[PDB]
Design a protein around this ligand. Structure first.
Ligand SMILES: C=C1/C(=C\C=C2/CCC[C@]3(C)[C@@H]([C@H](C)CCCC(C)(C)O)CC[C@@H]23)C[C@@H](O)C[C@@H]1O
Lengths: 239, 8
């Protein structure tokens, strides 16, 4: 077959949305509290994640249909999925040769050891890197990468969502685009759609573990004080 | 209500 006009426009809009919210130069990173190598990396990684939440919000706003949901559903979707979108979009700076995220300098090269100096343990980080390796080996086209972020964000099985029918219909429309793209445009992707759906289930498990560990972190005033207001709101339990 | 999330 052949991809349709509406499917084409969706892909174009999502790729443009990603290009507008992901800056390959990483030059904004000098504006964060500097990295230091008791939780010497938490200020820098809190700033990195806070910055990235703002980018994911800008991305969400350009997903076709997302802005038509109620503000409450948008926020519910964003709050539940933010850490997952961040884990996905970070694959773009992840390197197999270094087994770390490299963002334009040795100061902004993040390995597993750096994240333990931000309060997290191998219970999260070991699965997280295996996720990055397996996702890197999928060799996603940019179109697929951005579709998967939009699909992850538009999941209806999140706590706090009201219009479950409308959100599932949006997500279904993106899955169909992704399935048609893989069939037509990606040589040898017979098993790829299923592998990408499986990555979404990996993300759910990494979300749970991050949330557990974030709670232990954020309940200590000496540590929550080093977070940012946006991180506290997005990852918080306030309803 | 969320103060900052009300830039949704
Ligand atoms: C941000 C992004 C990048 C790396 C993501 C990383 C590397 C460092 C450790 C991170 C940030 C994980 C941390 C365990 C998240 C914990 C944050 C907190 C301390 C608040 O609990 C999640 C994603 C990992 C860089 C760039 O790709 C933009 C992307 O957007």
């Amino acid at each position: 077959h052949m991809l349709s006009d509406e499917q084409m426009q969706i892909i174009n809009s999502l790729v443009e949305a990603h290009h507008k919210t992901y800056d390959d130069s990483y030059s904004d990173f000098v504006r964060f509290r500097p990295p230091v190598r008791r939780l010497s990396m938490l200020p820098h990684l809190a700033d990195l994640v806070s910055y990235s939440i703002q980018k994911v919000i800008g991305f969400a706003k350009m997903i076709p249909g997302f802005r038509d949901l109620t503000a409450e559903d948008q926020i519910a979707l964003l709050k539940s999925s933010a850490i997952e979108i961040i884990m996905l979009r970070s694959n773009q700076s992840f390197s197999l040769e270094d087994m770390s995220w490299s963002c334009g300098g040795p100061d902004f090269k993040y390995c597993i050891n750096d994240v333990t100096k931000a309060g997290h343990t191998l219970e999260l980080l070991e699965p997280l890197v295996k996720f990055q390796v397996g996702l890197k080996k999928l060799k996603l086209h940019e179109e697929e990468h951005v579709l998967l972020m939009a699909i992850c964000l538009l999941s209806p099985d999140r706590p706090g969502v009201q219009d479950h029918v409308r959100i599932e219909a949006l997500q279904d429309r993106l899955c169909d685009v992704l399935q048609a793209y893989i069939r037509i445009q990606h040589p040898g992707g017979r098993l790829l759609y299923a592998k990408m759906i499986q990555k979404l289930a990996d993300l759910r498990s990494l979300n749970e573990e991050h949330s557990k560990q974030y709670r232990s972190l954020s309940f200590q005033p000496e540590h929550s004080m080093q977070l940012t207001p946006l991180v506290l709101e997005v990852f918080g339990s306030e309803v | 209500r969320h103060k900052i999330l009300x830039x949704x």
